[model samples]
Target chain A: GRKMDIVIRAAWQLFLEQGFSATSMDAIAKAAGVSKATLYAYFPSKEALFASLIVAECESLQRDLPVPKLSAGLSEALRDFARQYLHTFIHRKDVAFVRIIANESGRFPVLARLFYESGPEATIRRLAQFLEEARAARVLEFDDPMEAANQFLSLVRGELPLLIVLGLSDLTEEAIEQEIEAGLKFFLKACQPR
Target chain B: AGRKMDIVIRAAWQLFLEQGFSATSMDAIAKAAGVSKATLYAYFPSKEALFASLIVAECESLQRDLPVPKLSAGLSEALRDFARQYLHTFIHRKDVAFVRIIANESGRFPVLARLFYESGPEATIRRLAQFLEEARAARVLEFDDPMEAANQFLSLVRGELPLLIVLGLSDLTEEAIEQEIEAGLKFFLKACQPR
Candidate 1:
């Protein structure tokens, strides 16, 4: 089970440093201090290795925070969501991985689609579901919960996440707080208990 | 003179589209256009000038086709106007093309960035400022300046449009976009204006 962890980590290091396109299995095998045949015995292909790395990261994220329960009100729900979203943005290696993939998505559509569907798409879908439940319970009123979900996340992301992804770290704290406050006001006004 | 001008534009467009703006060379453009190195310079003063022409052509077509109208009233009127106008521009063939170029080029070429800013950015600022002015004059809204209004309007625009493009949904249909804009306007109106 843990047999290929070393190889995987080595390959990840190479992938991060040289990028996915430039990194090679030969290099990974060397970095892992293993033979090419041994590396293949574990990871059959380069695509398989990438998929495994991404899968491992997603598993780590899930382990870190298993699906959070929806709270009583929109404010609590959004606050919790924002805290978690900001946590992921700032602390997760996957965030950086996702950004790199996003930038090169035009070239690597398979990885792009996987990241979108597995990562952000799933996150938004979950957020939308929570919003829908709250709306149905008369806690909020949103005609389009998906749009609300996207807007809410966009507000959370605002400019800081992008700047952070691009290696600019100055506005992280201010941006998140401002986004949460403004987004709550906007979302609450829309809901208006009707 | 006219022939040389056409040659430069065609050459530059081909190279810019292929290798992107910063990567393209004037010597390559001259060679591709079948003109002497200095002859290409005779038509356009700089690569920036030629790139600016392309950007203007794209923005002119967008402004002409989108038809940004001045409507009279409050949130509903402003929302409808923005939704309709933006829907038109969002779906326009050239507008989408130019948007792609802008997203790509702005990150790479400073001249292309300036062209996009001066061409479309000012117009958006003006149109949104007009909405704020109209709202304030009607006493239907509260705002000290049009810049505040512009920033809010931009917030709504920034939320969805850029994400849609980055995520590769740039071909979103007119009806779908209008509906999204309508929803965003709803959120903006509820937040900004009280009934």
Candidate 2:
């Protein structure tokens, strides 16, 4: 219900400030201006509430906006997907949400499950779709789409999200563009028709 | 007093792991270990002592287990040490634990905590620099600065191994991880030549 919304939003804000452990359900309910009963009616438990938030945030992020279909080619589809994903990733609340969840996921075991199912697994599945289309079009040959997707993710992992996580560095617009070029080059290398 | 110190250290580590260093009180540690404030005082005397003890224990244990690289050792010894120090993260886990602790306590225990933070990395980099110096001065290897060599060694270790462990990925075996170190050394060696 809407009360669930209130608790989720409140807990999310509280978590950002106080982290997961220090924030209590009572504190969340008080912040949300909802009774504890009402909060529990929607969430069932603290873990459930967070799991729901993670799922909603990740799915909403993964849901790409409609792209103008081009009968032109597979590269066009990949281009569209990359542009959409990059825009959403670079400038979304979900990015921050994911960061916090990933950081704390080690402690809160359930969060990892929700995150993997709701986010990374889905992203790989989408990448596999593009790979399948590319293969069908004879632009590339791939024995394993999952492996290709994982390699691309590892490349990004080695480069972008990681820097942000460790506070070692920042990603500039120039850096993002460079990464996109690098990612495209690597992915194409793996998928080349030679 | 020694047993009491052990209790305090154990309690502090647990509390530090759970609530972090800033939020963890000496009072909380004493209580968790079922010791009075007076007893904890007798052993550790201050939070600084507790922190210093943890660092000492970690560094001492690491030194004791320093991977043996023989004078006549092949290229594999360098790679082996890299994998041991990092990939296994036997030592690396202790460092990460200390990082989370120092990050949490940085503001609170500015002076002592900063020293602890600097010591581990500095000691590591310094030792690596010495190795480079010995190799070069002895005319066995030719590197510009040992510090640069230290950073190069660190970069390979830092690049993927710790992150993988932190992220709960596979913990690679020594044989398995040696390949990564080899590749990392290859990058360093190749970079020395003109691009």
Candidate 3:
């Protein structure tokens, strides 16, 4: 697992840079600084390597996701969740990772489902669990916590994630804070109980 | 670059949709347009220009076809109408393939992506922002930053729809689409209630 890290990393970069259709497996092995046969032996194929790479990253992101504590006020707690989400979604190139999946999905349709399951579905489920907890506490009033969770995450993202993916603009730190503040406000206000 | 530019872009658009941006090339476009390689290169500097031109033209064309509905009497009606048109343009009017192409190559050509954003998506923000500004001026709404307000509303309306579309894993229906607008606007209307 430790040694396969190099090969998986090289594969991910090459895949991201050149795209899966254009990236050669040989380039991955060579760039990883491993013998080609050794690389192929350890990994069954390029698909296996790509699959392993996504799973690896997803596992790491899964382990560290910040789940805001409901002990604080609902607004304050969700803000914590929103801030951490924004950090990964905005500052990091997790945006690029999504784009790469979208680009290559047509050729390798399986990648689309794999990515959605590994990333979006899992994250949404985690957020959904938090919202359900909020609902139980009588803080937020929403019919579907699962959908509410998804909407909040998407609202927070805005077009910012897509803009970064498009290389259109470099949003400032101040601007990102505003995004988290405003989007979170929109969400909580909407969910305010009668 | 010339009257022939549109025709060349037309050819390029067809090929881009049929194949893709990376697969389609200058020679293929030139042949499709029945133009010389020299003239094709003369008209547009690079494949990037050709792609950008097509998107810009589509952006302008969509503006003509789906001009954001005139600001309505009530603030609720106004945003509802805008939200409807916003979703329509992005999800229905615009081609998913083209968006996928731009997003796919955006990293490869950062400069053109910047230009593409200015001409296409950023322009949509302006359309809604202009209305938000006017509404605030008329005391129809209150917001510090009209542009930022517009961005979030669209984002709220957007939700995960476009992301799913971009990922080629699509499942939004019309009932679902209307519900999305309804839900997002509830939050927006409450947040912007004449303060």
Candidate 4:
């Protein structure tokens, strides 16, 4: 477990710094101070390693917005969820990760789906489950939890993520906070029970 | 002004589409256009400038079909029409490829990207914001900042569709476009409802 952690930590730094295409397994092994055989034994290939990293990141995000109990305040829970969700995508390192995924996925289509499953789909599923619970408790009134989840996330992100990807906007912390706040207000207003 | 310019523009655009910016050369462009190398240089100083011209044309084409929000037509209907026109123009196959080129190559040619953005996204946003301002003045919409509303609305309209398109995973079919725009507009209009 310690060795796996060391390899992943080294790979994360290298991947973020040099990009996926440029960062090779050999370099990762060197960076981790592990034998090449040991690295391959753990990851098998570069793609496998990358997928594990994505899964780990998603797990980290899920921890931040754990499933709510019956008594959890929906609004506070969602706002926190919104903040973490936005921060996960908008931060510098994560932004680079997304860019590498978008840029390199043309050659590795499978990885794109892997990322979608690990990141976006996972996020949506958790949010949908939360919404379903809220709706059951009669606090939110939505017919479809999944659709509501997608809509809520879309409103939160808007075009800001894409703008950052396109190099059209500065990814400042202040900007991220402002956008998330506006999105949360709109989302809350829209999801209010009639 | 003449047939030669049209031929050159068409040839250059097609070559760029097929072979990309770095691969397509002036000689090939000139040959495809059936013009002399000197004439090609005379018409456009460099490939970057030529690409900018093509993007300007694309921007104008997108602008040509944009629908102005009419207070008399009801905000929802007008927004629907606007979304339709935008989707029709923006999500087409050719537009996607053109945008992919810009996004992929912008790092190498920042000026070209800036030119395209100025002519394309910035211009489109301004026009949309102007329409929102008009709607706000007419009491049809209640937004504190027209530009911010425009950004949010455009984002809602686009959603994750553009990224999907760029990744070559999906096509912008009529049904898909209609579904996304309708859903986006519903969320947007609800948000815009007067407090």
Candidate 5:
């Protein structure tokens, strides 16, 4: 509706369609109905626009995400976090967005780090903090919360996300639920009071 | 790429990329390669077999050069070597490119994807499980299931570097890659710590 959102929305569609290398600023400007000068002022280049676009998408994920301050129990809290975060992460549009990044990773070296930082890293940090809290309560024990956080994510998501990214599987709700349950089960046993 | 079938196989691979397994027919490939479909039939029994040969050969050759690290130092270093080999092999340019191609076509060529998995990732897992079973036999790493243990170690060590690289997100520096492998290895050792 507004200028920034309009430009970003326009670029998001074009970038996915034509690829980051193929989509141009002028084309985005035309699609956005903004002046060329205004487009450059907002996002100077394709990389800049893309960097903003993915970060904004992460910002999209962050909104309304369930915090890990558990009122019910550790298992439910962690499962809720995984379910909510993963549902958004593996949604069709978001999966396609990640596919584009993987497809184009060779062209832009920095965007991979940028993309990882924008979305994946944020979740790790969030989960790591919660793990620290749980660690303080003596329910979990680990030398490094961040590393533990990374493993929990890697294990919980497992290769299912990879399959989604690779187009080898479907995103049926049942499958996603199954994955979260399996991962949470393993994660608890791995870190269970020891 | 050896003899007569080599050229034919290469031709099939090219068509496999452009038209996919479902859309491409044997006759169609014969025409493109200027070989008779009869000759093709004798060489590759089915389109499925031809594709299997192509991807299987590719995955096999990826390991042709890897002289796996002898289990040196201790159980920790051996597992670390396993992680190192996995990350290095899995994220190479050839591995990345073929993986994308396979994933891109995975929906349509689901069976071919299985073939690829067996040749590549599954093969790696089986090999690693052997080492894990060895460690377990020696009482270094303790676990109920070798295959399950292998999957856990791989899942942990994989972390984000391979995913990021596969997604074309990061070309991590040596130090960064080191941190990821070591970080995963640290947690893996603890989890498998002998009781």
Candidate 6:
């Protein structure tokens, strides 16, 4: 158990720092201070281990958003949710994670598919479920919950994610906040009852 | 001067599309264009310059075909038309291929990527922003920052389609893109509704 923790920590660090193609299992084993056999026993292959890191990284946002208080207005609750959502992908670590996937996934189609399902699609599904609940409570109104969720996430991303993914820019705290505030206001205003 | 340059550019673009940037070479391009290597270098100094010129040509052709926003048309109609035309040009398979080629070569040619962005997205956005500013002056719409609103509109218009295209998971089919733009404009218009 202790060794597994050590291996995970070491693997995540190497993978993030050196990227998927650059880092090797041998290096991972050496870094983890474990035999190659032990590493294989814990994780079958490099892909599985990388997938595990991605899952562990997304574990926070994969869960349902905490229910907002009854006294909180829909706009406030949605704004709070939007900030956390933006932070999940825009943070330095996740940005690097996405960059690695985008770069290596061309050679590994399954890895890219696994990432899309786990990361972006999963995030959208969770937000859609939240929107459905909000609609049931009459806190928000929209024709299509899934489409609403897609729009919300897309608007929140703006140009920052594209620029970052292309290695053109970094995600600063100020940029993240400005995008969130503007995107949430637009999304909330859109979902309001006519 | 102009005729030989056109032939060279045409052949180079075709070769770059058939193969990739790295795989295609100046010799092959010269052979394909039926020109002397000296003449090729004389017209375009390096492969990067040749590629950059091709991209600049693409931006010119793309922007040239875009429908201008009509002041006579109401805001919703004009915005919807703009989104449709924008998506139609943007999601074309050839355009997507060029983008993928540029993105893959971006590491080696960062200048090319920046060139594409300035000529493509930045120029497109500035044009749309000016149109929105004009609409605001006409009292057709109310917005604080035209550029911010223009960015928001472009994001909504893009949605997840561009990523899907880039990832090779999807194609820019006519029916698929129509639905995407229609839905995107609906959401965008709702957001931009005058207060």
DockQ, each predicted model: 0.24, 0.08, 0.48, 0.32, 0.45, 0.32
Regions of model 6 farther than 4 Å from truth: A1-76, A91-113, A133-139, B11-38, B45-47, B105-109, B171-176
* Model 2: fraction of native contacts: 0.03
Q: With candidate 2 superimposed using the best TM-score fit, by how many Å does residue B161's alpha carbon deviate from the native?
A: 8.6
Which residues of candidate 2, in runs, are more than 4 Å off? Answer: A65-90, A93-107, B1-86, B90-95, B98-195
lDDT of 1 by residue, A27-145 (tens): 99888888888889898998789888887786666455434355545577677777677677678875557545645535776766666666666677778888888777777776788
Candidate 4 TM-score versus the reference: 0.75
Give the per-residue lDDT digits (tens) of candidate 2, residues A1-194: 67667677889999877777778889998999988887777778878887788878787877663332336565555555665556665676544655465466377655655676677667767777767666777787756776555544444444344333334334676766655554454445445665
Error of 4 at B53 (Å): 0.9
Q: List the residue pairs that clash in candidate 6.
A: none
User: Candidate 1: which stretches are off by over 4 Å?
Assistant: A1-36, A58-111, A125-139, A143-145, A156-172, B1-3, B41-61, B72-78, B84-118, B121-126, B140-175
The CAPRI quality class of candidate 4 comes to acceptable
In model 3, which regions exceed 4 Å deviation?
A24-41, A91-93, A105-107, B8-55, B70-81, B92-112, B132-144, B193-195
Instruction: List chain A TM-scores, every candidate, in order.
Output: 0.86, 0.82, 0.90, 0.78, 0.87, 0.81
Q: Write the per-residue lDDT of candidate 5 for residues B1-195, one digit (tens) a residue.
A: 437788888787787677656677888888877778888888889988887888889889866544353455677777776677677775665665556566656477677777777787777778788887777777777777787777777888887666666666556677777787888787777667764
Candidate 3 residue lDDT tens string, B80-154: 877777788656637466556766664777766677677767888888899888888878677788888888788
TM-score of chain B of 6: 0.85
Can you write out model 2's per-residue Cα lDDT over B62-88, one digit (the tens) per residue?
655545444366544664564466444
- Report RMSD (Å) for each prediction in the order shown: 5.2, 7.9, 4.2, 4.7, 3.8, 4.8
How many residue pairs clash (N, CA or C atoms closer than 3 angstroms) in each of the candidate models, in the order given? 0, 0, 0, 0, 4, 0
Q: What's the CA error at residue A148 for candidate 4, in Å? A: 3.0
True contacts kept of each: 0.15, 0.03, 0.72, 0.31, 0.62, 0.35
Q: CA shift at A73, candidate 5, in angstroms?
A: 2.7
Question: Against the true chain A, what TM-score does chain A of candidate 3 give?
Answer: 0.90
Candidate 4, B117-147: lDDT as tens digits? 7787778788889888988887867867888
Docking class for candidate 2: incorrect
Q: After the best TM-score superposition of candidate 3, give how far the Cα of residue A52 lies from its true spot, in angstroms.
A: 2.0
Candidate 5's C-alpha runs over 4 A off are A1-10, A29-44, A92-94, A105-111, A171-178, A189-193, B11-38, B45-48, B63-74, B130-144, B167-179
Winning model by TM-score: 5
- Per-residue alpha-carbon lDDT of model 6 for A82-115, expressed as tens digits? 7777766655355566557655646777776776
A best-first ranking of the candidates according to their TM-score comes to: 5, 3, 4, 6, 1, 2
